[PDB]
Scaffold this motif. Structure first.
Motif, PDB file in Angstrom:
ATOM      1  N   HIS A 384       0.822  -1.198   0.000  1.00  0.00           N
ATOM      2  CA  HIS A 384       0.000   0.000   0.000  1.00  0.00           C
ATOM      3  C   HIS A 384       0.866   1.262   0.000  1.00  0.00           C
ATOM      4  CE1 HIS A 384      -2.146   3.259   2.127  1.00  0.00           C
ATOM      5  NE2 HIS A 384      -3.119   2.908   1.312  1.00  0.00           N
ATOM      6  N   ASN A 387       2.564   1.745  -3.401  1.00  0.00           N
ATOM      7  CA  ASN A 387       1.546   2.148  -4.367  1.00  0.00           C
ATOM      8  C   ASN A 387       1.159   3.624  -4.226  1.00  0.00           C
ATOM      9  OD1 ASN A 387      -0.494   1.202  -6.381  1.00  0.00           O
ATOM     10  ND2 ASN A 387      -1.887   1.968  -4.780  1.00  0.00           N
ATOM     11  N   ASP A 470       1.413  -6.378  -9.451  1.00  0.00           N
ATOM     12  CA  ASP A 470       0.294  -7.108 -10.047  1.00  0.00           C
ATOM     13  C   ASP A 470      -0.815  -7.085  -9.010  1.00  0.00           C
ATOM     14  OD1 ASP A 470      -1.617  -8.748 -11.165  1.00  0.00           O
ATOM     15  OD2 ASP A 470      -0.267 -10.422 -11.593  1.00  0.00           O
ATOM     16  N   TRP A 471      -1.557  -5.974  -9.014  1.00  0.00           N
ATOM     17  CA  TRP A 471      -2.537  -5.750  -7.963  1.00  0.00           C
ATOM     18  C   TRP A 471      -3.631  -6.807  -7.954  1.00  0.00           C
ATOM     19  CZ3 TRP A 471      -2.246  -3.499  -3.663  1.00  0.00           C
ATOM     20  CH2 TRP A 471      -1.358  -2.425  -3.484  1.00  0.00           C
ATOM     21  N   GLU A 472      -3.999  -7.337  -9.118  1.00  0.00           N
ATOM     22  CA  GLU A 472      -4.982  -8.415  -9.148  1.00  0.00           C
ATOM     23  C   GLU A 472      -4.471  -9.636  -8.415  1.00  0.00           C
ATOM     24  OE1 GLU A 472      -7.668  -9.080 -12.267  1.00  0.00           O
ATOM     25  OE2 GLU A 472      -6.628  -7.636 -13.570  1.00  0.00           O
ATOM     26  N   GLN A 473      -3.166  -9.916  -8.541  1.00  0.00           N
ATOM     27  CA  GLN A 473      -2.590 -11.038  -7.805  1.00  0.00           C
ATOM     28  C   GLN A 473      -2.655 -10.785  -6.308  1.00  0.00           C
ATOM     29  N   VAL A 475      -4.855  -8.868  -4.848  1.00  0.00           N
ATOM     30  CA  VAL A 475      -6.267  -8.938  -4.485  1.00  0.00           C
ATOM     31  C   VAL A 475      -6.641 -10.371  -4.178  1.00  0.00           C
ATOM     32  CG1 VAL A 475      -8.521  -9.013  -5.634  1.00  0.00           C
ATOM     33  CG2 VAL A 475      -7.198  -6.851  -5.581  1.00  0.00           C
ATOM     34  N   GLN A 476      -6.197 -11.298  -5.032  1.00  0.00           N
ATOM     35  CA  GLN A 476      -6.493 -12.711  -4.833  1.00  0.00           C
ATOM     36  C   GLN A 476      -5.897 -13.217  -3.521  1.00  0.00           C
ATOM     37  OE1 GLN A 476      -5.660 -13.372  -9.224  1.00  0.00           O
ATOM     38  NE2 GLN A 476      -6.342 -15.463  -8.735  1.00  0.00           N
ATOM     39  N   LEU A 478      -5.322 -11.483  -0.855  1.00  0.00           N
ATOM     40  CA  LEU A 478      -6.061 -10.884   0.253  1.00  0.00           C
ATOM     41  C   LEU A 478      -7.335 -11.643   0.563  1.00  0.00           C
ATOM     42  CD1 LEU A 478      -5.321  -7.142  -0.535  1.00  0.00           C
ATOM     43  CD2 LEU A 478      -4.754  -8.398   1.605  1.00  0.00           C
ATOM     44  N   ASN A 479      -7.918 -12.315  -0.430  1.00  0.00           N
ATOM     45  CA  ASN A 479      -9.200 -12.989  -0.254  1.00  0.00           C
ATOM     46  C   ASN A 479      -9.122 -14.331   0.483  1.00  0.00           C
ATOM     47  OD1 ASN A 479     -10.650 -10.981  -1.579  1.00  0.00           O
ATOM     48  ND2 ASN A 479     -10.690 -12.059  -3.564  1.00  0.00           N
ATOM     49  N   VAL A 480      -7.969 -15.005   0.535  1.00  0.00           N
ATOM     50  CA  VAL A 480      -7.945 -16.393   1.020  1.00  0.00           C
ATOM     51  C   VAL A 480      -8.168 -16.518   2.528  1.00  0.00           C
ATOM     52  CG1 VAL A 480      -6.260 -16.794  -0.807  1.00  0.00           C
ATOM     53  CG2 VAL A 480      -5.523 -16.753   1.576  1.00  0.00           C
TER      54      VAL A 480
END
Lengths: 482, 491, 482, 491
Positions: A384, A387, A470-473, A475-476, A478-480
């Protein structure tokens, strides 16, 4: 998840508030000339009650630090979190910290004055003046400093004067994100060690492994009374954790073949895969190390004297002790092992993924470790900061740091990269106060870690962006873990 | 993992590409068409209750013919139980009237090594419907703009069960929210009226003021004034909810007042509804204000002696042509927007009752400070990201944009003040057009009926993309931190 | 939980409806003279997609049954449960059942006509006439028959006429509650077998165990080509489940000492505790069994011929095959093992409790097994029937079944007990249709099981009550597993 | 496991017995009292926010002195985190004004072998408050009437931190709901008014009818009529909620009408409120009907020419002495009952806002058919079983009764028609009295200020005990199947 990063954001703001106002942690008397403060994670080697963070206060001229354990509460926890926090703050003082800081929402739906309430209870009943209370309004997650200007001190603290022995300043973590000792341990090693702990939990009567006769004979000379297994695994207790260490060490790293000193160097390989999958790792040999140097040492030393050499080049006993300390530290920091030594649900889960999807170098295994580093290792906080700081620089000037190329056209070079990394670093150390000081090295451990796990791209930098995350990576990850 | 809906969208796009590469996946050997194109889209809320994960539309060399395949997607997190749900769901979709259905399920589970074969076998043995296809997938590559490309295999094809229209249906995988008329507060108040009426269907009825009832009786001598002023004819539950909501909250007695007359002078009343504007600045307005100056135009034509008061009432209820909507036309269009959005947000059942999600939205508005609170804004944003499928849209834009700028960070730029590259408004329009061509021709997630204004404004307002519309080296700047919060919410 | 019992209540009502109206499952043609129906659980040996229950239809004069798999849905599952049910019903027909019955709420909040909807889809698209649909209004849990009169048939079924091979009537369970084969397996055996499966999952390279030379020599004579381990464990595959069986069998039951045939009988004991904790169990010896009889058989048979005897008294191979079938059946029925053979979360949990609280005979271990028998074994259904039937008898007449004692005062005797147990049994078989026919035995297996786990008191009966059920203990069992 | 609250009650009873067996657990050597008795009870809702799991009251040879210990109970299911919560909770309780606090926590956890020592150490090292005791426990024996008897050890005693009353506080571990005035519908409507007012604190105010406003002005010339007729003086949030609820739902304009006068004849209006009776037969009544014949008595004294109309209004607002409550007295007593129950059900915050549980109750009433629906009845029953602590009460009655009848199934019976034993009403009163003596003297879960009518009626109405009050060999027949449903609900 969201909670880990928010605690990091609040810890950075607390460190900034003490620098702006040292009276928050010092009485009118004993106000020091200059204090610096920086926030860090709490090392797993500290006691069971784990803090959300640590803020270190350093004094001018001294080599000692006063450490404040931070407890952060969210509204989603409800007002019940206040009473949890008071108890946790007492737990942190009992652990030996000089102070504790409770950081809680400024109001709840139920309660208009939660921080006043926590301050009152501390004042009325606890009688411990080393516990501070801070309250906050909702953070601005677009900012590099989401809690900047949004936290007030409702109760200061004073460091207990009855402290004769002060914490050393070079002790403890220096970043909010976890540094893995990037050399001795591997993903495969965490996997096998958990596997041995699952094996031993099911068969505690398991027979100790048997050393080669030449090795067992050699141990008889150096440690005539010592048990040879305890000797070469460098253990003294018979507790669960030390026994799993013994089986893991002798089964997986110091295998019979690896424990073979000479054939000449034998060229032995262990049974633990390197993370890159090319081969198995090597212990004590490969360059001119222990086995190869002892082979050269036998140009003259005796053959028997070589065993004394084997057991500033670490021997079997010395490597066994340091490697045990590494794997013990990392597994606890990742929260994969209980203080008692049993695998946690997360430790079991990582082991299960490795067993089901082809081992510790599988995508599912790499992805679970990465998700652990993002949440449990707090690299979400670090991402964060990089970024928001980068976006701020590049939104202002998309060509920032570039250098004139052949036609005058901007290109983001390696020099551009190093200038930008150094600006991020002084911003993290001087403004955010999220790292301390104990070169193309600035963030090498973090970036290598992040790149290896797919959170930053193999291209190290790009114009208009900086570190391409790779913010999508992320994001993934963070979800687990539900 | 990513979002369940986003993974379904990635699979629908890959299915649509697979049908173009091999039309024999859905056509018998004799049924080979001249030329077939396929695209994935969401399913319109106006369709039946059993909602599909997606729609794949097939167009042939035919001019007006479209064939729709209802898609059900299963994740390993749903477990081996999801396989039997999907068989039932696929039958539900064919019963709804779709020509075909496709089951997209994992290639393996922890429990079961051979899941798709199981579904193929069960369909073959018992069902006897050949209009259901089964696809198996390996884990998607979220690095790619096309995460399932080459990662989905057909285990069982389908054959189209034997009029059909081609210009019908949604044209994007993401939902277009109808801009302009409805607000979060309107969704909230409408769900409250439906919940109130559901508990007390008998006792309430709204009261019109006497001048309006007299005016309606003179305009429409036979019509019941409430049915007239709310533009309704049915007595269905959804219609009564509309009537109460319209008169309680929007066309309130004050708002239904066309003019104020004081001493020979006519003036627009300055009425405001009881529904907050999304921006929180004021309550919204009907027939007055900045969008519709209908009352002001009527009062000005009364003051100039151009029209009678009787003609003024006709203009108020009936509108003025060019452009200015009257009460009836506004009521009918407002009813159609709010019905559509609530069904598409899945906040309301076809029956008119609030769903679990509508209940959750209402509870957040009631307890945490109303429809414009941070909690209400967060709940709506999460709904648009998940139920509106903007997570898949953001992934497409992100990956497509990253693909352009990673190869050339100065892509689209033009010479600026120093000779230095500048990303201009022209750069943006060029980049947006390239995104369009990829979304329709490579990804097959949109089809032709240029701008993305509706999508970007919505995303911008909920904080998912930046207030600056574009940046050099980036294109549309996406706030993935905000996207994380929406994905985690679970409606 | 609540769901298991409710499905049992609905299955009893479906069985009653078919007896009252055989046209629900038979076409106008082929209507039989007399049919009987009874509900039972589905045996774990049937396929993966597990039914909520089975209803068996028996025809007059035949020895065959037609079986209907039952799927029960609750409103809490929502209308999504309808589409699940349609797919499950197709799964049950694919498994080989003659029919399937979907039992679903009569209305939902969302949907006025759910059963009409399910019937329509079946009619329009499926084309399978062997799937019936039933709808229900809320059950009366005070009744012995909570769904009596509260279930209507919205869609009948007809049994597929293309069925040449009919199911035998003596096949399958005869009760709604699970009968454990109460002789060969123990709590300790389930524990150790799961432990071996956890061991093997962590070390698949585990070396096979070594038989004594005399045993390995003897196997060479009877099965010259066969692998001796496969021979004495009676396995042929190398699948995971068979390998865990091999280690479990040779480590825990047929241990080297137990495999010792003679010393005379050796008096060997296995390593598996009896549930009563007195000693370890015994295999093939103890009375005049295999080892003792072969010792007597050597009064004449040769010493070598004794090994042929060892491998109507079951030998090592024969017992290994039947015991494997028992432990495999029970573990699957308790849902402690996947069809693939890995332990489930519940299997791991039972193993963990045994490891943490002192083994399979601990209170925590007995309590978890009991909670499994109440929910997964469906003894909650059985307890509800005994309770409501008993309360109905005793609320009407608190002295029911008593006999005049010395003064004429009522006493509930052993004869009172047997009359009451027989009334419960014919009520369960004739009225509720929850058990079938294939004596002071009436409910011996169930009551011994229930008493051992603390659900019924050590006193077998009491006046005014009948079987004294420890309902608080049952309540506690109902609450577990979240 | 059993209920969390029930396990806390079992521990509080055992703690109270431990203090009687060893008063040195809470008294310094010099502070030994003449004679000490202790009993466990719930904590009254009127106490502070941080609610304790229980209260243990200590009485000495003193005549009016009571010392209260706030009890916090932790389960292993709460984990090692509960230990730190309990330390904070114990400080909160002393801050609330309790003389002592007791932490009751498991002897071991999976994580931590030595939890109670940890708490003792932390309290000793940092807190410095000697008024907090720590008890450790081994698993309870739910077979016993006293599941923790001999299974709890004191790891740290307490010393009472230095006026106090003995006749104060609840006298049972289970909550007495105030019978007669409130209903499920009243709790529901009141929570709805508080939620409405919380969102819109400004705009609404209720309107009294003109005759009543004229009558109040003549009765109380200076008083504001709304404050007068609702019997309020404060302007707190909870008071405004009361005012709206009273006039919106109970003392509605119709119900506030004392009489109807037609052609010289006075009659009671037959008004009904808007609040359903619990039995669903009709709406409830105030000042009229079967409980209070106040309006009928006033109309009969007007018709007989005993009183003026002015005197009639005085009787309506002020009541008639014996016995007949007037408007003001009814408003004040109704306000006190409904406030108490809602706080005790933990449906309302001290601030007056609905809690999560109040929100859950309101949502069930709104969506599943109102306050008399099966879902609403089930939610209330679960609340009484859990929050009202009737699970512990049922366990005590069950175990105490089982203990009597297992030894002698004919216990309490008397010779009947054939000479055969009969369990009569005398048998019941003997058995109920034995239960009382055990509950107060052996279990220490109740104290003296005979019947159990309030408890049994409540339990009977929610289906937890049988409609027949007693049975031979059983005593009170408990429906544990119904008790299971309530325990599983999780409020």
């Amino acid at each position: 998840y969201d909670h880990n990063a928010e605690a990091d954001f609040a810890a950075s703001e607390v460190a900034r508030m003490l620098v702006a106002d040292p009276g928050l942690c010092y009485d009118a008397a004993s106000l020091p000339a200059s204090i610096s403060a920086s926030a860090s994670y709490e090392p797993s080697a500290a006691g069971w009650p784990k803090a959300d963070g640590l803020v270190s206060v350093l004094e001018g001229g001294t080599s000692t630090q006063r450490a404040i354990a931070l407890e952060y509460k969210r509204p989603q926890e409800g007002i019940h979190g206040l009473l949890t926090a008071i108890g946790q703050a007492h737990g942190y003082l009992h652990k030996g910290y000089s102070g504790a800081a409770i950081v809680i929402p400024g109001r709840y739906s139920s309660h208009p004055t939660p921080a006043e309430y926590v301050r009152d209870v501390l004042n009325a009943i606890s009688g411990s003046r080393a516990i501070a209370v801070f309250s906050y309004s909702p953070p601005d997650t677009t900012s590099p400093t989401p809690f900047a200007g949004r936290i007030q001190c409702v109760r200061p603290l004073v460091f207990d004067a009855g402290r004769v022995h002060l914490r050393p300043a070079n002790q403890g973590p220096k970043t909010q994100w976890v540094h893995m000792r990037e050399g001795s341990t591997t993903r495969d090693a965490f996997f096998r060690f958990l596997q041995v702990a699952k094996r031993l939990s099911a068969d505690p009567t398991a027979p100790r492994p048997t050393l080669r006769s030449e090795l067992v004979a050699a141990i008889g000379r150096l440690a005539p009374g010592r048990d040879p297994i305890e000797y070469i695994t460098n253990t003294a207790d018979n507790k669960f954790l030390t026994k799993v260490w013994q089986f893991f060490w002798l089964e997986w790293l110091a295998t019979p073949a690896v424990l073979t000193p000479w054939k000449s160097a034998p060229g032995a390989r262990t049974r633990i895969l390197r993370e890159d999958g090319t081969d198995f790792s090597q212990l004590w040999e490969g360059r001119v190390n222990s086995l190869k140097e002892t082979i050269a040492g036998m140009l003259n030393i005796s053959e028997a004297q070589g065993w004394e050499a084997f057991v500033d080049k670490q021997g079997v006993r010395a490597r066994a002790h340091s490697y045990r300390e590494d794997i013990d530290s990392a597994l606890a920091q990742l929260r994969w092992i209980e203080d008692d030594g049993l695998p946690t649900d997360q430790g079991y889960r990582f082991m299960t993924i490795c067993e089901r999807y082809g081992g510790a170098n599988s995508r599912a295994a790499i992805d679970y470790m990465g998700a652990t580093l993002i949440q449990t290792g707090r690299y979400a906080s670090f991402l964060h900061y990089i970024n928001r700081l980068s976006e701020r620089k590049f939104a202002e000037n998309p060509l920032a740091y570039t250098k004139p190329g052949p036609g005058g056209m901007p290109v983001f070079t390696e020099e551009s990269y190093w200038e930008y990394l150094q600006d991020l670093e002084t911003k993290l150390t001087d403004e955010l106060r999220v790292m301390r000081k104990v070169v193309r090295t600035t963030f090498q451990v973090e970036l290598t870690l992040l790149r290896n796990y797919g959170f930053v791209s193999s291209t190290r930098h790009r114009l208009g962006v900086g570190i391409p995350i790779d913010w999508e990576q992320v994001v993934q990850a963070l979800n687990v873990d539900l």
